[PDB]
Design an enzyme around this catalytic site. Structure first.
Site, PDB file in Angstrom:
ATOM      1  N   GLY A 108       0.673  -1.029   0.011  1.00 28.07           N
ATOM      2  CA  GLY A 108      -0.001   0.052   0.033  1.00 28.07           C
ATOM      3  C   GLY A 108       0.701   1.384   0.062  1.00 28.07           C
ATOM      4  O   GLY A 108       1.983   1.342  -0.788  1.00 28.07           O
ATOM      5  N   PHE A 109       0.418   2.251   0.847  1.00 26.00           N
ATOM      6  CA  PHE A 109       0.965   3.559   0.875  1.00 26.00           C
ATOM      7  C   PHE A 109       2.078   3.680   1.683  1.00 26.00           C
ATOM      8  O   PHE A 109       1.715   2.943   3.069  1.00 26.00           O
ATOM      9  CB  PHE A 109      -0.126   4.628   1.297  1.00 26.00           C
ATOM     10  CG  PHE A 109       0.238   5.880   1.303  1.00 26.00           C
ATOM     11  CD1 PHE A 109       1.179   6.398   0.371  1.00 26.00           C
ATOM     12  CD2 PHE A 109       0.138   6.670   2.404  1.00 26.00           C
ATOM     13  CE1 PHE A 109       1.705   7.814   0.344  1.00 26.00           C
ATOM     14  CE2 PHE A 109       0.666   8.036   2.536  1.00 26.00           C
ATOM     15  CZ  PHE A 109       1.321   8.612   1.494  1.00 26.00           C
ATOM     16  N   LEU A 110       3.248   3.929   1.213  1.00 29.83           N
ATOM     17  CA  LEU A 110       4.717   3.910   2.137  1.00 29.83           C
ATOM     18  C   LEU A 110       4.722   2.515   3.091  1.00 29.83           C
ATOM     19  O   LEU A 110       4.807   2.860   4.431  1.00 29.83           O
ATOM     20  CB  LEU A 110       4.757   5.078   2.999  1.00 29.83           C
ATOM     21  CG  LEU A 110       4.816   6.494   1.804  1.00 29.83           C
ATOM     22  CD1 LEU A 110       4.413   7.554   2.868  1.00 29.83           C
ATOM     23  CD2 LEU A 110       6.394   6.375   1.424  1.00 29.83           C
ATOM     24  N   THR A 157      -0.637   0.284   4.504  1.00 29.44           N
ATOM     25  CA  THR A 157      -1.940   1.026   4.574  1.00 29.44           C
ATOM     26  C   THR A 157      -2.542   1.254   3.246  1.00 29.44           C
ATOM     27  O   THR A 157      -2.148   1.309   2.224  1.00 29.44           O
ATOM     28  CB  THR A 157      -1.189   2.533   4.787  1.00 29.44           C
ATOM     29  OG1 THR A 157      -0.743   2.500   6.054  1.00 29.44           O
ATOM     30  CG2 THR A 157      -2.473   3.661   4.876  1.00 29.44           C
TER      31      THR A 157
END
Ligand SMILES: [Cu+2]
Ligand SMILES: [Cu+2]
EC number: 1.4.9.1
Lengths: 125, 382, 105, 382, 125, 105
Positions: free
Chosen positions: D74-76, D93
Site C-alpha cells: 500500500g501507501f509507504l 496502509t
C-alpha cells in the site's frame, strides 16, 4: 544540473525546483496539478500542520519561514516532482523534517500525499 | 522534469504575482481551489497506466495548456463526461488488498468545479468488463440521467445505472454485441459479432426489445475498438484497419447507413498507409469533419503510434488536410467549438500536444500525464 | 460539551488583558506541563516564537469532536473557556512531543 | 533502461531450454512457480514509488541478478524480513477509494517461497507513521514473534503485533523518541529529541519500563534517518551529516556507546566531502565493517545520490577502501555472508547495481525496479 | 526502434518483445518478474481462458497457437512491457482480442493484470 | 449438487468410449448445442480444434458454485455426470457467444 551543488534560489518561475520558496519541498509542486503556489488543487484536503524551513528570497534579501503543508487525499500527482532540503533535520526534529507526510489536520482525515504548497508564514529573523 | 513553454509562461507569471503580493505585504492564506467552469476547451486525459491497479485522470484547460484538476481511479476505469458540463463520472474497480482480495465495482459522479464525488454507486457482483480502455464501453444517455456499461462475462449484458436516483437498476441481457451508443433515455445501439448493429430498447422491467440491422461489413473487414460517436449528431464514425470509414446515422434512433468513404487514397494504401493508434479517429459535429491517425506501417502494427492526421469532409469524403504531427501520437480528439483544437496524445511521451485543427500547428503541450495516457474526452457544450 | 471557544481564529498577543491566565510557547515548549484553573476560567496560549504552534485536544476530550486549535504565528494568541471540572490533554498538531494538560477544578 | 547483461544471458539460456522442450515434443503445462529457498544473497528492493498510494517490493536473487518474485503493498509500507529466512512481513496502509475514504493499516506476513500471505492483521485506529521509508520504523523482535511499529501522531507510541498469535496486541506510550531497535523478545531502543536513548521493556500488559541513557550527541550534530542496525550483533551504527559515526553496542541488553569515528578525513571534510543519500550506511557483522555513501556536496544536499562508498573498520575506524560506483546511488546494503555483495540502488535509474564488496567492482545489475526504489533489505542467516 | 515496421520474431531471447511466442502479447513478459516463459510468478493466480494467436517460429518454420494466459491478482509488474498484435482482431472477435484482461478462471477469482505467459496449445495455419 | 465431475481436468479424447454421449467442439461451436440426456448420463465434450474451449455453467445451475471447466486443448475431453432432471445452460468462458444446453429428462 549538478545535483550536489549548493541549491540556488530564483524568484522567476514557481514550477521549477529552484523557485525560492521550494527550499525544503519534498514531493510535487501543487501549482502543477491545479493548485497554485499557496493553494490546494480542487478535490484534495489542506493540511494545517507541516514542516517549515526558512528560505532566502533573492529578490528582497530577506529569509521567510515557509510552511510546507501537503494537499492530501489524492494519489501523488506525478507532475513537477522535487526534493530540496535546506536546513532540513532528521525525523527526531520533526518540525524541520521533510520525509514526513505533512497531512495532519486535512479535512476528512485525508493522509495520502498529492502535492505540496509553499505559503509564507512570516519572517525568519 | 523538462518544462513546456506554456509551463514557463504560467510559472513565470505566477512567480511575478506572488512577488507583488509579498511586496504589498499581503499574507498567504492557504485554501482549496475550485476549477474554472467547464467550457468547450476543457479536455480530459485518462491514464490506464499500462494496467496498473490505480489510475489517474487529468483535467486540463486546452486553451492555456494548464492542468486544472485531477481525479483518481482504480483498475481500468471507464470515464464519461456530460456534454453540458454538468458532471463527470466513471465506472471503476478497486480491491481490498491493492490487486487482490474483494473486488468492488462502483460508479462515481463528481462535481466538475469542486471535483468532489456527489455519488458513489456500487455495482452488484463485479460486472464491469476489464479491458484496455474503450470510451464506448460505458456511456451516458442524452439527458445524463443514466449510465450504461458493458458486461462481457459470463454473458453479454448491459448494466443500467440511474445517476439521478443514485442506484444501480438492473442488467439488460443483450446479443453477442459490443460497445454502447445511446440515443435516448432507453435506447442504444451496439456492434455485433456478425457485422450487424443491434438496436436495444428497454423498459422499466423485462427483457429488452432487440432489432438488428443489415450486416454492414464483411467478416474480413476489421472495425477498430475506438469508433467516434457524436451523441448530439447521432453520427457513428467507424474506421476499419485499412482506413475505410463506415458512417451510421443514428439521429433518428434507427440506423441509416451513409456511403462509405476511404480516408486513404489507393496510392497511399498501395504504399503501406493505414490508421494506427488507440483513439484513431475524431469527429467534429458542427464542421462535419473526420480526423484519422495514419502512418506507413505493416498491417499488424495497428496499435502503434502515428505521425499524421488526415482530415476529411464526412459528407463527401473529400480530403481537406493531411497534417504531419511532429510526434508519436496514439490518440486524437477535437474540441467542439467553432475553431476547434486538435488534441494529440502520445502515450510514450505522456504528453498531450494541443494543435490548431485548421492549420495543424502545435500551439502548446502538457507533459507528465501519468504512466501511459490513452484516452481523450471532451464535452460537446454547443 | 466541556469548553467554549472565545475566538474562532488566532488574535494578537497585545489583545490579552493584564490578569489573564496565560500559557507562553517558546523554544518548542508549552510554558506549563500542567495548568490548574477553575471551572469557567479562560486559558490563553501565546506563541512567542516564529515557529507556528497550536493546541489540539483529541476527540472525546472537550466533547465528541476533536478541538484542533488554529495555528498561531509569532505573537498570536488563542483562548479556551473551560466549563466542566476534569483533566484535559492537548498537543501541538505538527509537534506530538509538545504536550500539555489543563486541570479544571 | 532496456535489457541488462544478466537479462540477455538469462533470457537466451531460457530460450534454448524452451526450444529443446518444443523440439522434443514436451507439452506446455502452465502452473504457478515457487521462489528458491531464502539464502544469504536474496535481496529485497522496496519501491515507495515517490509517495504513490500503491507500492511494490522486488524479491531478488543477488547471485544471478534475477527477480524471483514481487510483493504488492500500500501507501509507504514498512518491509521486515526475518533474519532466519522463515518469513517476510510488512506493515501497510490502504484506503477504500484509492487515496481517500476509509483507511486500513494492517500487517501481512508472507511465506518467503510461495509469497502467499499467511497472516493479515489489522491495526486499529490507523496508527502507522506515514513517512518516506525508514527500515527501523518497523521491526521484528529477535525471536521473530513480535512486530513493533512507530506511531508519531497523536502522540509517540509503539505498536505491538503478535505475529505468532496473528493479533494486534496494544500501543505502548513512549517518550519523545524515534526508530525501534529491539534487542530481546521484550526490549527495544529508541533515539530521543534530547539526544539520548530510551530503553523500553514491555510485558504482556501494563506501563512498559522505560529508562534513558545520557545524551550522547550535541543538538547541532544531526544523526541520520537511516542508521545501520545489526540485531544479532546488537551493533547500532549512526552517521551524522558530516560522516562522524556514533556506535552503540546493545548485545549486553544495555547501551554501551563506543568511541566516535570519522568516516571522512579532515582533508576530505574541508574539500567538501559529506555523506549523502537515502540508506547511506551499511554494516557487515562478520567483518565488523561500515560502508558509507559519500561524495562532494553542499551541506544541505544530504538526500542526493552519491557516487562513492568508503569502507572502514568499525573498531579501529581505519579506512580500508574507497570505491567509485560509477552511478548515482541512493542506497547501499550488504549481504551478511563471508564474501558479501555490495548492493547499490539508484532511485533515479530504478536499477539495483550488484557489487563485489571486496573489490568495489560492478558484477551485474537489475533494472525497471518500479518508479522510485529506495530500500534494500537482506536477511542475516549465518 | 521502428515501431511501425513489420514484426520480426527471434528464438534466442524470451525477455525481449521480439521473441517469437510474444507475437500477440499485451502487457508484461512473466519471465521478468519471477515466473517463466510458461509459468506464473510466485504469489500470482493463473487464468485458464485467454486470447490466442498463431506465432511463426523462425526456428522450425512452423506456426504455433499461443494461449496468452494472464497471471493475475497482482499490480502490473512494470518489467518487460510489450505490445504485439500479430493477427489481433477487434473485441467483437475476443478469441483473438488482446486489450482484454484474460484472467478469467484464475484461482481466487483474481482479475488484476500482472504479466502474461506464452505457452503453446497446438499448431496453426 | 446436480452433476459430478468424472475428471477434474481435461483428459485425452482417445479415452472416451465410442458411443459415449459426445458434444464435439469445432468452428467456435458446440456441435450439439441442445443435447437431451436421461438422469444418470455422463456427457463428454471433446475439442476438435487448436482453439481452447471449455464448458461454464453459472452459479445456481449445477450447484451454488459456478462450474468453470478446464480449457480443453485440441483432442482433449471433459465429462460431467448429470445427476438430476432439468435444463442446464452453458457457454464457453473466453467465448461467451458459444452457448450450449443439456436437457436432463
Ligand atoms: Cu508546536
Ligand atoms: Cu470457446
Amino acid at each position: 544540473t549538478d545535483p550536489r551543488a549548493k541549491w540556488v534560489p530564483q524568484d522567476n518561475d514557481i514550477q521549477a525546483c529552484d523557485y525560492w520558496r521550494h527550499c525544503s519541498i519534498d514531493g510535487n509542486i501543487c501549482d502543477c496539478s491545479g493548485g497554485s503556489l499557496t493553494n490546494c488543487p480542487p478535490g484534495t484536503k489542506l493540511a494545517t500542520a507541516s514542516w517549515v524551513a526558512s528560505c532566502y528570497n533573492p529578490t528582497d534579501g530577506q529569509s521567510y519561514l515557509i510552511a510546507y503543508r501537503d494537499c492530501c487525499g489524492y494519489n501523488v500527482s506525478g507532475r513537477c516532482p522535487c526534493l530540496n532540503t535546506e536546513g532540513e533535520l532528521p525525523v527526531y526534529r520533526p518540525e524541520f523534517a521533510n520525509d514526513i507526510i505533512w497531512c495532519f489536520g486535512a479535512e476528512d482525515d485525508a493522509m495520502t500525499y498529492h502535492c505540496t504548497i509553499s505559503p509564507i508564514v512570516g519572517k525568519a529573523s | 522534469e523538462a518544462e513546456t513553454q506554456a509551463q514557463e509562461t504560467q510559472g513565470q507569471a505566477a512567480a511575478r504575482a506572488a512577488a507583488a503580493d509579498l511586496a504589498a505585504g499581503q499574507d498567504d492564506e492557504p485554501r482549496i481551489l475550485e476549477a474554472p467552469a467547464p467550457d468547450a476547451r476543457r479536455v480530459y486525459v485518462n491514464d490506464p497506466a499500462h494496467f496498473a491497479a490505480v489510475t489517474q485522470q487529468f483535467v486540463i484547460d486546452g486553451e492555456a495548456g494548464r492542468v486544472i484538476g485531477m481525479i483518481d481511479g482504480g483498475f481500468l476505469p471507464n470515464p464519461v463526461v456530460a456534454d453540458d458540463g454538468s458532471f463527470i463520472a466513471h465506472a471503476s474497480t478497486v480491491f481490498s488488498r491493492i490487486a487482490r482480495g474483494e473486488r468492488t465495482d462502483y460508479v462515481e459522479v463528481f462535481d466538475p468545479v469542486t471535483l468532489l464525488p456527489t455519488a458513489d454507486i456500487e455495482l452488484p457482483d463485479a460486472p464491469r468488463f476489464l479491458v484496455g480502455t474503450y470510451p464506448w464501453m460505458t456511456s451516458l444517455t442524452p439527458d445524463g440521467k443514466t449510465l450504461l456499461f458493458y458486461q462481457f462475462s459470463p454473458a453479454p449484458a448491459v448494466g443500467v445505472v440511474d445517476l439521478e436516483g443514485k442506484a444501480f437498476k438492473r442488467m439488460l441481457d443483450v446479443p453477442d454485441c459490443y460497445h454502447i451508443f445511446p440515443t435516448a433515455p432507453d435506447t442504444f445501439f451496439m456492434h455485433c459479432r456478425d457485422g450487424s448493429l443491434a438496436k436495444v430498447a428497454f423498459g422499466t422491467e423485462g427483457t429488452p426489445e432487440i432489432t438488428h440491422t443489415e450486416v454492414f461489413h464483411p467478416e474480413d473487414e476489421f472495425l477498430i475498438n475506438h469508433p467516434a460517436y457524436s451523441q448530439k449528431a447521432g453520427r457513428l464514425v467507424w474506421p476499419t484497419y485499412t482506413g475505410k470509414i463506415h458512417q451510421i446515422d443514428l439521429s433518428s434512433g434507427d440506423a441509416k447507413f451513409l456511403p462509405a468513404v476511404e480516408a486513404l487514397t489507393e496510392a497511399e494504401r498501395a504504399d503501406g498507409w493505414r490508421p494506427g493508434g488507440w483513439q484513431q479517429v475524431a469527429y467534429h459535429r458542427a464542421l462535419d469533419r473526420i480526423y484519422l491517425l495514419v502512418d506507413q506501417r505493416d498491417e499488424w502494427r495497428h496499435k502503434t503510434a502515428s505521425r499524421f492526421v488526415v482530415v476529411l469532409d464526412a459528407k463527401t469524403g473529400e480530403r481537406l488536410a493531411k497534417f504531419e504531427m511532429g510526434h508519436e501520437i496514439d490518440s486524437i480528439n477535437v474540441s467542439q467549438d467553432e475553431k476547434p483544437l486538435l488534441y494529440a496524445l502520445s502515450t510514450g511521451d505522456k504528453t498531450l500536444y494541443i494543435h490548431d485543427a485548421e492549420s495543424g500547428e502545435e500551439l502548446r503541450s502538457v507533459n507528465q500525464l501519468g504512466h501511459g495516457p490513452q484516452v481523450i474526452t471532451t464535452a460537446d457544450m454547443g | 460539551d466541556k469548553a467554549t471557544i472565545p475566538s474562532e481564529s488566532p488574535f494578537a498577543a497585545a489583545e490579552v488583558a493584564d490578569g489573564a491566565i496565560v500559557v507562553d510557547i517558546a523554544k518548542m515548549k508549552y510554558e506549563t506541563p500542567e495548568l490548574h484553573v477553575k471551572v469557567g476560567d479562560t486559558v490563553t496560549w501565546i506563541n512567542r516564537e516564529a515557529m507556528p504552534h497550536n493546541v489540539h485536544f483529541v476527540a472525546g476530550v472537550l466533547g465528541e469532536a476533536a478541538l484542533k486549535g488554529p495555528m498561531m504565528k509569532k505573537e498570536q494568541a488563542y483562548s479556551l473557556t473551560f466549563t466542566e471540572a476534569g483533566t484535559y490533554d492537548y498537543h501541538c498538531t505538527p509537534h506530538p512531543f509538545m504536550r500539555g494538560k489543563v486541570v479544571v477544578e
